[PDB]
Design a protein around this ligand. Structure first.
Ligand SMILES: C[C@@H](c1cccc2c(-c3c[nH]c(=O)c(F)c3)c(C(=O)O)[nH]c12)N1C[C@]2(C[C@@H](CN)C2)OC1=O
Ligand SMILES: [Zn+2]
Ligand SMILES: [Zn+2]
Length: 232
């Protein structure tokens, strides 16, 4: 009923959208992994009379449900998708997207890692993102590579029309007491990568984490704090 959704308010097998700003939504879905249930976020950005999707809904069936929810709530076609790193919460569902006619994109680093790991593989490579601090435009967003953090390939996404910063899994929600799943992380570099984000997007008004509730710029400092303390 207007609050940011959570696992407790998304019916089983479902996806919910949340309006962030004019022409900007997050998508929220839930998935099981190693016997626990987790929410995860993605982004939808209006691109004229089309939509740009950022990240899958963490699985084939969740991603089909995402497309159906988008058709219900927005009614514009998803023409392109970008996955912000190689984990299943970002690429699981790329096969569904591609069979629905969505053109799927990721960095070459993400594509290589996804292939090696046995995850679904976006079709198209995003060049120009291989060095930390790199940025490229992609429709209504800017894609930024901050350096290694949650993963070595993680991208962030900025929507300049709305000053919305989608941090993906390199950014954690304010209630987070832990640095999440750090299996593929670089804890030593992560605070330096967050500092790059802070420096590049000082006018961000909304910050959206890869899992959990959006907030403001404080998510970035909080993330740095939690990662340093986890490593400590
Ligand atoms: C798919 C993704 C994943 C699975 C389950 C939970 C999480 C969390 C998370 C946890 N706990 C939180 O409290 C939180 F808010 C977020 C995150 C995140 O933190 O982004 N990602 C998760 N995978 C799996 C795996 C690839 C590696 C096997 N080779 C292990 O790593 C990875 O991230
Ligand atoms: Zn991940
Ligand atoms: Zn994640």
């Amino acid at each position: 009923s207007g609050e940011y959704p959570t696992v407790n308010e998304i019916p089983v097998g479902e996806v919910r959208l949340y309006q962030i700003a004019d022409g900007v939504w997050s998508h929220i879905a839930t998935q099981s992994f190693d016997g626990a249930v987790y929410p995860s976020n993605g982004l939808i950005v209006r691109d004229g009379d089309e939509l740009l999707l950022i990240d899958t809904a963490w699985g084939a069936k969740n991603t089909a449900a995402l497309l159906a929810e988008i058709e219900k709530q927005i009614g514009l076609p998803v023409t392109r998708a970008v996955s912000t790193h190689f984990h299943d919460d970002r690429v699981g569902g790329v096969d569904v997207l591609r069979a629905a006619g969505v053109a799927t994109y990721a960095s070459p680093s993400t594509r290589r890692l996804a292939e090696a790991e046995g995850n679904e593989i976006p079709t198209h490579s995003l060049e120009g993102l291989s060095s930390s601090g790199d940025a490229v435009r992609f429709g209504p967003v800017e894609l930024f590579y901050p350096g290694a953090a949650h993963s070595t390939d993680n991208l962030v996404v900025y929507v300049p029309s709305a000053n919305v910063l989608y941090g993906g899994c390199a950014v954690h929600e304010l209630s987070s007491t832990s640095a999440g799943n750090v299996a593929d992380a670089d804890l030593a570099e992560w605070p330096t990568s967050v500092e790059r984000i802070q420096k590049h997007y000082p006018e961000a008004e909304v910050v959206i984490p890869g899992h959990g509730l959006p907030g403001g710029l404080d998510l970035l400092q909080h993330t740095a704090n939690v990662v340093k303390a986890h490593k400590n």
